Amino acid sequence: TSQVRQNYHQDSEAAINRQINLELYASYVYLSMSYYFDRDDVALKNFAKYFLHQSHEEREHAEKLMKLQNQRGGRIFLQDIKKPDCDDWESGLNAMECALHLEKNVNQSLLELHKLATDKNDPHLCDFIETHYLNEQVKAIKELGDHVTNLRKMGAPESGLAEYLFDKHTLG
Amino acid sequence: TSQVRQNYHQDSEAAINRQINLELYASYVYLSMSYYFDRDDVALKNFAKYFLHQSHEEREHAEKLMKLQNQRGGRIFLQDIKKPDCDDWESGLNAMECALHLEKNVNQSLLELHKLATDKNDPHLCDFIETHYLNEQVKAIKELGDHVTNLRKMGAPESGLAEYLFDKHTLG
Amino acid sequence: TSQVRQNYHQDSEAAINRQINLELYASYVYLSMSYYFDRDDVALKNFAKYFLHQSHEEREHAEKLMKLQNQRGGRIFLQDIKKPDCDDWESGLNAMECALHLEKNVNQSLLELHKLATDKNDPHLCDFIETHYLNEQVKAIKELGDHVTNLRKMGAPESGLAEYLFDKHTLG
Amino acid sequence: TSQVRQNYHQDSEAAINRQINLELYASYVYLSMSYYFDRDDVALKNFAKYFLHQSHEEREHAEKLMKLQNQRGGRIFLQDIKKPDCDDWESGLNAMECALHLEKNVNQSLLELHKLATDKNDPHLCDFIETHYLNEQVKAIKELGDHVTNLRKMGAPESGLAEYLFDKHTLG
Amino acid sequence: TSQVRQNYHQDSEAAINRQINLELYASYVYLSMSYYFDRDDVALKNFAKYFLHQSHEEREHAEKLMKLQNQRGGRIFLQDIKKPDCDDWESGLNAMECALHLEKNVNQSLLELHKLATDKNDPHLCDFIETHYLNEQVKAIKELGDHVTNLRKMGAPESGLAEYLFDKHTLG
Amino acid sequence: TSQVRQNYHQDSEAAINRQINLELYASYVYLSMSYYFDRDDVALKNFAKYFLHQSHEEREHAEKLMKLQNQRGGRIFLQDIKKPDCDDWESGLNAMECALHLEKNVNQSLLELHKLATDKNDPHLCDFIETHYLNEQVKAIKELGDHVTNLRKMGAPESGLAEYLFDKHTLG
Ligand code: NA
Ligand code: NA
Ligand code: NA
Ligand code: NA
Ligand code: NA
Ligand code: NA
Ligand code: NA
Ligand code: NA
Ligand code: NA
Ligand code: NA
Ligand code: NA
Ligand code: NA
Ligand code: NA
Ligand code: NA
Ligand code: NA
Ligand code: NA
Ligand code: NA
Ligand code: NA
Ligand code: NA
Ligand code: NA
Ligand code: NA
Ligand code: NA
Ligand code: NA
Ligand code: NA
Ligand code: NA
Ligand code: NA
Ligand code: NA
Ligand code: NA
Ligand SMILES: [Zn+2]
Ligand SMILES: [Zn+2]
Ligand SMILES: [Zn+2]
Ligand SMILES: [Zn+2]
Ligand SMILES: [Zn+2]
Ligand SMILES: [Zn+2]
Ligand SMILES: [Zn+2]
Ligand SMILES: [Zn+2]
Ligand SMILES: [Zn+2]
Ligand SMILES: [Zn+2]
Ligand SMILES: [Zn+2]
Ligand SMILES: [Zn+2]
Ligand SMILES: [Zn+2]
Ligand SMILES: [Zn+2]
Ligand SMILES: [Zn+2]
Ligand SMILES: [Zn+2]
Ligand SMILES: [Zn+2]
Ligand SMILES: [Zn+2]
Ligand SMILES: [Zn+2]
Ligand SMILES: [Zn+2]
Ligand SMILES: [Zn+2]
Ligand SMILES: [Zn+2]
Ligand SMILES: [Zn+2]
Ligand SMILES: [Zn+2]
Ligand SMILES: [Zn+2]
Ligand SMILES: [Zn+2]
Ligand SMILES: [Zn+2]
Ligand SMILES: [Zn+2]
Ligand SMILES: [Zn+2]
Ligand SMILES: [Zn+2]
Ligand SMILES: [Zn+2]
Ligand SMILES: [Zn+2]
Ligand SMILES: [Zn+2]
Ligand SMILES: [Zn+2]
Ligand SMILES: [Zn+2]
Ligand SMILES: [Zn+2]
Ligand SMILES: [Zn+2]
Ligand SMILES: [Zn+2]
Ligand SMILES: [Zn+2]
Ligand SMILES: [Zn+2]
Ligand SMILES: [Zn+2]
Ligand SMILES: [Zn+2]
Ligand SMILES: [Zn+2]
Ligand SMILES: [Zn+2]
Ligand SMILES: [Zn+2]
Ligand SMILES: [Zn+2]
Ligand SMILES: [Zn+2]
Ligand SMILES: [Zn+2]
Ligand SMILES: [Zn+2]
Ligand SMILES: [Zn+2]
Ligand SMILES: [Zn+2]
Ligand SMILES: [Zn+2]
Ligand SMILES: [Zn+2]
Ligand SMILES: [Zn+2]
Ligand SMILES: [Zn+2]
Ligand SMILES: [Zn+2]
Ligand SMILES: [Zn+2]
Ligand SMILES: [Zn+2]
Ligand SMILES: [Zn+2]
Ligand SMILES: [Zn+2]
Ligand SMILES: [Zn+2]
Ligand SMILES: [Zn+2]
Ligand SMILES: [Zn+2]
Ligand SMILES: [Zn+2]
Ligand SMILES: [Zn+2]
Ligand SMILES: [Zn+2]
Ligand SMILES: [Zn+2]
Ligand SMILES: [Zn+2]
């Protein structure tokens, strides 16, 4: 047992390790999306920049969870980072919809983590999740929903002009 | 024989003279394209600026090859600069596709030059080509491919609105 | 076939995808090492900082390879990022020795990639590897060898005072 | 007929195209001279700089004529740029004398162009020629005549010391 | 075997040691030349400055090769630095011609080193030579050839006025 | 006889040439030491920096003696620079002891030179030696003796921790 460990349940430690893997997976998905939009036959540089930024953000989220795991005296156990579901993301609108799905999945995992911390009476972990992850997820989901709505209203994915102008004016 | 000449094959000297002519020809092609887009019945000022910039860049490439020829003790032999294949470049998309074709032709010539320098065991010439021309060509080809992709997706050449907005937002 | 693809062999494209996976794996290994040294029962903050910096550097190397893959018209195919070989890295000296082993493995992969590009007469790829990866690997290997030498001479891993003072004076 | 064309005779349009070719030819001649003086067995860097500057100036003159052609609604028709008469320019004095001959040829062409514009009652073209080309040619011819006079008086081409000191003190 | 050594052939290590000695020898030759021109009966201060600068440059080249030898895990073996061939360098023109000969000798040694590294499939060593030595040698040879050409054309060595004015205007 | 030579004995001229060779030899010894400490299996960067600085200082001493030789109208005669006695300097303490021995040898040579200049009634040479070399040698010897004393008291060469901390705190 770690000399710093206090009120940190083994179930919470395991769930934090699972969340670390999920954040690294999300980082990998976003990296794949970014370099899909960097292809010469897609060529939407601001979509690529947006998703690269999201990938780095998700890496930071994972690293903050690893720091938490050490702060509480738990032990980090890493697992394989599975490859993303797609190599070809088909369009800016499709990539935004997949990103929305992924962010809602990550949010659900975080809500289950908060429920577990509440059940184990771990207020520090509950506060950590609320302070650093929950409103970040709500804001990310709202932003992606806005992007999806605007692309659809502009005529994406059928309008390449729609995705070009969205790349310029919203993501630029 | 030049007092500075060392490990510089006559075949390499001839191929450098051929490359000088090819770069000057590319400069002339781009100059023609630029002033096509400066016509009152075409009137795409940022296409004109883009191609004028490319023309000056190709002139600089030719001058760097002439400097190399003198540095190695070879002798520059200039030839006629042939007129470009077109007077009317028909559209921004067509001009970008022709520019892509031209840059791939110049790249192929440079790869043949590198093969010759490798065969003649001229590492200074190989390094010169790699350092100053090969990645420049790869970047130029990727940029032109991106431009072609975006124009096609926006609906060029049938959409004059597409070429207008591309002129404003990508080339502006 | 990509509109930008020129002198880019399918074998080279596959080897670049393998190298991308290897760089991401190295990033993951370094991330694991960093947060091992962030544990309360290890508590070497400058070892943790060093390895976190290396992890971000390896991510950048992977992203540069993905950019190259797109520049040449190849297609990125991502694979699972396997978990690192260890969860517990045992000591600063042991982690440095493992890092040296990993960097020499990455260097060997890059040398095989250069041999393949030479065999396929791809001077742009050869130059890319030489310019951005080979001297970086040589410098990294020399630095890690220096660190290992100094830790051993100071008495690591048996001297915790040795690793403490190395953390302060070399990595701080 | 161009929507902007007014009081622009077809003969004037043809003569402007001929002048464009002549200016590009002069640019090429000066480029050849510059890199003759960049040879290791000639090695007069300020002669090389002088003639490179003249080459870029002549390119600018050609581009201004192309802009005029478009401003008036004429159509640019480019022709081959013939190679310069010499590969070896023999001396600084000989190159200056050839440059003087070339500038007087260009001036004669411009005077014939002005005569044509006067005959066609095209005051805008007459003013354009007078404002941008005629005094430039007179100044260039006077400068080259001064250079030739000084080189001859100093003892060029027989005095290599003469050309060395002229390179340093007049062109430097 | 060094813990950092990888893909570094013993033949390459020996050739690098030979090149180190050759660079130190060149530094010594240039030092001798510099202080020849510092004599009261020669008294060409800018020739002296030029050759002193070259001597320090060659020392830097040798030190960079020693750094490379250590970076790759080879072992430096130093040898005697032989005295220069002359104590009296006879004139500025003669010293420049000897310097040109020496730089071409060093260039030939570097080309043989590059051939050896290519034969041993050592791309890091090939790139090191190309990046840091080959174009430096080509530029140095071209500069010395230019200096020799100008001195000869000015009338050196028979004209002491020629060497005086060259010292002032080219080397000053 | 030089037009500037006055009260400069041939014995003094010969002894100055011998001292020039000795200073160049000392520079070479220090260069060898520096790059011994740059090895990956020694890895004491501040020892390497210290000895590289000493090597450049000894080169400067040699050049000042060459300047003196020319100032007095003597003629510089260079000899081979013999290789240093060791390739492997075994430890920081051993290298410092060898440096102390070398500096005392150079000091003895300078004292013999001063005795010769006194015997030949050459006060300018005596003053030159006193002003530029004698106190420099005394200070260098005292500094090296201090370094040796501290390394021994810290437990070098048996304590690698001793040499590591000396490298950091005294030489850093
Ligand atoms: Na997952
Ligand atoms: Na395409
Ligand atoms: Na979902
Ligand atoms: Na959804
Ligand atoms: Na849900
Ligand atoms: Na051509
Ligand atoms: Na083509
Ligand atoms: Na094409
Ligand atoms: Na091709
Ligand atoms: Na791997
Ligand atoms: Na503990
Ligand atoms: Na290994
Ligand atoms: Na190893
Ligand atoms: Na290996
Ligand atoms: Na003409
Ligand atoms: Na010559
Ligand atoms: Na004429
Ligand atoms: Na004339
Ligand atoms: Na006339
Ligand atoms: Na030699
Ligand atoms: Na005299
Ligand atoms: Na030679
Ligand atoms: Na020669
Ligand atoms: Na040779
Ligand atoms: Na000695
Ligand atoms: Na001694
Ligand atoms: Na002693
Ligand atoms: Na003594
Ligand atoms: Zn513990
Ligand atoms: Zn791109
Ligand atoms: Zn996240
Ligand atoms: Zn954070
Ligand atoms: Zn902990
Ligand atoms: Zn635990
Ligand atoms: Zn694990
Ligand atoms: Zn997925
Ligand atoms: Zn697609
Ligand atoms: Zn709690
Ligand atoms: Zn909290
Ligand atoms: Zn909102
Ligand atoms: Zn010649
Ligand atoms: Zn080009
Ligand atoms: Zn350039
Ligand atoms: Zn030349
Ligand atoms: Zn030739
Ligand atoms: Zn010709
Ligand atoms: Zn064409
Ligand atoms: Zn048209
Ligand atoms: Zn070569
Ligand atoms: Zn080069
Ligand atoms: Zn718009
Ligand atoms: Zn494609
Ligand atoms: Zn890497
Ligand atoms: Zn990068
Ligand atoms: Zn692509
Ligand atoms: Zn493919
Ligand atoms: Zn896949
Ligand atoms: Zn591992
Ligand atoms: Zn442990
Ligand atoms: Zn290639
Ligand atoms: Zn490249
Ligand atoms: Zn029209
Ligand atoms: Zn003109
Ligand atoms: Zn202008
Ligand atoms: Zn027009
Ligand atoms: Zn017309
Ligand atoms: Zn035509
Ligand atoms: Zn001509
Ligand atoms: Zn000539
Ligand atoms: Zn008019
Ligand atoms: Zn008038
Ligand atoms: Zn006007
Ligand atoms: Zn003068
Ligand atoms: Zn070793
Ligand atoms: Zn050198
Ligand atoms: Zn250097
Ligand atoms: Zn080493
Ligand atoms: Zn060895
Ligand atoms: Zn030896
Ligand atoms: Zn010599
Ligand atoms: Zn003499
Ligand atoms: Zn290698
Ligand atoms: Zn190569
Ligand atoms: Zn390298
Ligand atoms: Zn004398
Ligand atoms: Zn180092
Ligand atoms: Zn000294
Ligand atoms: Zn000094
Ligand atoms: Zn003297
Ligand atoms: Zn004498
Ligand atoms: Zn001698
Ligand atoms: Zn010794
Ligand atoms: Zn040793
Ligand atoms: Zn005296
Ligand atoms: Zn004195
Ligand atoms: Zn003291």
Residue numbers in the entry:
A (entry chain E), B (entry chain A), C (entry chain T), D (entry chain S), E (entry chain F), F (entry chain D): 5 to 176
Please share excerpts from the published article on this structure.
Here, we show that coating the cryo-EM grid surface with ssDNA, or other negatively charged polyelectrolytes, reduced sample aggregation and improved the distribution of macromolecules in holey carbon grids for cryo-EM. The samples used for testing, hexamerin, human 80S ribosome and apoferritin, exhibited undesirable properties such as protein aggregation and/or affinity for the carbon support on standard cryo-EM grids. The use of polyelectrolyte-coated grids was essential for the determination of macromolecular structures from these samples. Hexamerin, human 80S ribosome and apoferritin are soluble macromolecular complexes with a predominantly negative surface charge.
Apoferritin is one of the most popular samples for benchmarking cryo-EM methods because of its stability and 24-fold cubic symmetry. Reconstructions of apoferritin routinely achieve resolutions of better than 2 Å and the highest resolution approached 1.2 Å. Our test sample of apoferritin exhibited extensive aggregation on standard holey carbon grids, which prevented the use of the images for single-particle reconstruction. The aggregation of apoferritin seen in our experiments was probably caused by damage to the sample during purification. Nevertheless, the presence of DNA on the grids did not prevent the reconstructions from achieving high resolution; for apo­ferritin, this was 1.77 Å. For the human 80S ribosome, which has a diameter of 25 nm, the distances were 29 ± 4 and 39 ± 9 nm, respectively. It should be noted that well prepared samples of apoferritin and 80S human ribosome do not aggregate on standard cryo-EM grids, indicating that the macromolecular complexes used in our experiments were damaged during purification or improper sample storage.
